[PDB]
Structure 1
Amino acid sequence: VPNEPINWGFKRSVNHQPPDAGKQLNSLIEKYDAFYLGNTKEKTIYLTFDNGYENGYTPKVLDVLKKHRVTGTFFVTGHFVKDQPQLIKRMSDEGHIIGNHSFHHPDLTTKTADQIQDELDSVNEEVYKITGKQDNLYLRPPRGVFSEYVLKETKRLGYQTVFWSVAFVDWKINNQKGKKYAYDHMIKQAHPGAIYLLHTVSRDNAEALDDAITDLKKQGYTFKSIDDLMFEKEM
């Protein structure tokens, strides 16, 4: 209404400057409740993760975040929550934010309002069964696919749609390139206000992250959460 499919994408950050999705996406983003950047006026980075399934490394990622005292926002699917309740419980117990990546991870633009409501509510329902808690409502569309209609409808349901400004190929299981590949991207693409989208399924991703946080802090970056981002802009 319009329900024209749009893929979240952007020219990567260069020279450590925030990237720009274009005047077209920027407008849509403002029109509804959504963002891909935090406060670009300060040297801050916000870490987010997409979690659809487990490959053995999320516990180490949680250990790394705890070590650095950093808060992550984990966008989870129905499958992930049902397959890994203990990890879901650790995210909650250790101060992180659990975001909604939808139950079945469908292309939301192909779903009715009614369906969308169940796709999102069912994830919170299961998370609550596990934690007895419920975070502020954040949504990341599956495959980054959305439309004006999906934005309008999810806003009406109380969700803040969260995109990203830094992402790389750390989700290909048949070609896990190791620590350096991931670490170098996290350093090179860094910029003020950056919202990083990371996966936790690739070989050594936790170690790369540990090194990246260590060196990004050394550079003067501070890591804040998606809740901080929302509250701080509110003022």
Structure 2
Amino acid sequence: QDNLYEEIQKHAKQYEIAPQNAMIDKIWKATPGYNGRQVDMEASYNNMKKLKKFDQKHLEFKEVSPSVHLEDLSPAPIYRGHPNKKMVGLTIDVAWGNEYLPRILEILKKHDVKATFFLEGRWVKENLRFAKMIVDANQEVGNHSYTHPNMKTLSSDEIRDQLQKTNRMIEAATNQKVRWFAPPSGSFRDEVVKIADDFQMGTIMWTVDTIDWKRPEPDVLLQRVMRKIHPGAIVLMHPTSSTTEALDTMITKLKEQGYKVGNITELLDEKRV
């Protein structure tokens, strides 16, 4: 009946996905947009013409940008990636735990996965070689304040000083520009978010807390994560024994469920997985 080209045409709408716009969710606050897609006729045809049969596995796509982007939103915290993006973001808050950093970095290398390392400024100052170790492993770093105060109760001057001192220390020690800020203990108010934005940083929270600082059994941590994970989840960890013992299996199980796993910059990208 139809030739292969017509069969691909007939299936094009079935695999089309509209782009999704960024918005500020009443509950989850600032959420990125996510690319849509349409069938690339030429690449799809070229992938199927040797076997002369339609195979959806061999479709290729052109992506379609949304109209409203994360950077268009008013300042607001980011808890999650887009809920249709089959990706999980890993964040690691670092103010201690040097002895676990090399193993964590090796596990990430083994899986070719990235995590955002949010660094406390005083920790960087006192542990320059470990800060360098993280970026030498090709991992991105973010701002975790300078002394881990409760930023919700700080004056605006103190918020500005905490953020600025930390960025100066991180950028001197790693030569990387800082894009992301993680509040200590997740404690913030609107003025924290606005001042972080004045330093050109988004404020990153999470949706899945490992609570690894309580030293759970590794399997208890793994099960906690798998019970709570979802598309666009951001997972909060620290350099702990629990995280280090669970991380290899955790990434394996996430990939088995169909998730891409990456850092915050990758998670919030509009590009499709």
Q: Structures share a fold, TM > 0.5?
A: yes
1:206 aligns with 2:249: no
Secondary structure of 2:213's aligned partner: coil
Q: Which of 136, 140, 147 matches 2:182?
A: 140
Identity of aligned residues (%): 35
Residue aligning to 1:19: none
Instruction: Give the structure-2-normalised TM-score.
Output: 0.69
Q: Distance in 1 between matches of 2:232 and 2:153?
A: 32
Secondary structure of 1:177's aligned partner: coil
Residue deviations 1:197-220 (CA, integer Å, cap 9, x gap): 11112x242121100101111121
Secondary structure of 2:209's aligned partner: coil
Q: Distance in 2 between matches of 1:23 and 1:198?
A: 26
1:216 aligns with 2:254: yes
After TM superposition, the structure 1 = structure 2 runs for residues 74-223 of structure 1, keeping only pairs within 5 Å, are: 74-131=117-174, 133-172=175-214, 176-201=215-240, 203-223=241-261
CA RMSD of aligned residues (A): 2.4
When structure 1 is superposed on structure 2, of 81-90 and 92-101 the one drifting more is 81-90
Residue aligning to 2:29: 26
Aligned residues: 208
Secondary structure of 2:88's aligned partner: strand
Q: Distance in 2 between matches of 1:110 and 1:86?
A: 32
The answer for unaligned runs of 5 or more in structure 2 is 1-24, 31-69
2:210 aligned partner, one-letter code: F
Q: Which of 265, 268, 273 matches 1:227?
A: 265
Residue aligning to 1:42: 85
> Which is greater in Rg?
2
Secondary structure of 2:29's aligned partner: helix
Residue 184 of structure 1: how far off its partner (Å): 1.2
Q: Distance in 1 between matches of 2:239 and 2:196?
A: 26
Is contact 2:254-2:261 (8 Å) kept? no
1:87 aligned partner, one-letter code: F
Secondary structure of 2:269's aligned partner: helix
1:160 aligned partner, one-letter code: G
Query: For the structure 1 residues 25 and 212, does the alpha-carbon distance in structure 2 shift closer, same or farther, using more than 3 Å as the test?
Result: closer
Q: Distance in 1 between matches of 2:218 and 2:98?
A: 16
Instruction: Give the structure-1-normalised TM-score.
Output: 0.80
Residue 178 of structure 1: how far off its partner (Å): 2.3
Residue 222 of structure 1: how far off its partner (Å): 0.6
The answer for unaligned runs of 5 or more in structure 1 is 1-21
